[PDB]
Amino acid sequence: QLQYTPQNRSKDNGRVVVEGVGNLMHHIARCCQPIPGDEIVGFITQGRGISVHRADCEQLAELRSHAPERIVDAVWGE
RNA sequence: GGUUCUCCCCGAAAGCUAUUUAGGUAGCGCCUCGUGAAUUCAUCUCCGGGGGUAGAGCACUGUUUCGGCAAGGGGGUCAUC
Structure with a gap:
């Protein structure tokens, strides 16, 4: 009965700062549920902007088997 | 319900079928007596047989676990026309 605020903060910006850039259309993955653990690794998607598909x-890695240029680093900050 | 003298020989059935039949009856099965014929009949060993039961098996009809490969659908990844 109790079933976006947690992602309204990402919709309120901050978090991910790929290669030191702020306010990007980032969005956490799924097969991997990254949290500020093994850091993370970003990936540019056609639409949807950056996909934070967790580090490792x-x-x-499949995307690391296709277009490496799309691949990008990742951080957290606060 | 009961059915009164005596000895002798043999000696059943409580089954099938039908029955406004199912505790009755009839045909037949088994009884007895009489007559008449096949070494006809019974056991046995040898011989020629069909069997699908026990048992066993899982090719088939089903059922069953496990391991394998893996359709194909599910969830996600880039995609999402």
Whole structure:
């Protein structure tokens, strides 16, 4: 009965700062549920902007098997 | 319900079928007596047989667990026309 505020803060910006840039259309993945753990690794998607597909994950590595240029680092900050 | 003298020989059935039949009856099965014929009949060993039961098996009809490969659908990844 109790079933976006947690992602309204990402919609309120901050968090991810890929290569030192702020306010990006980032969005956490799924197969991997990244949290500020093994940091993370970003990935540019056609639409949806940056996909934070966690650091070290198969599907991320698959993308590492396709277009490496799309691949980007990742951080957290606060 | 009961059915009164005596000895002798053999000696059943409580089954099938039908029955406004199912505790009755009839045909037949088994009884007895009489007559008449096949070494006809019974056991046995040898011989020629069909069987699908026990048992066993899982090719088939089903059922069952496990391991394998893996359709194909599910959830996600880039995609999402």
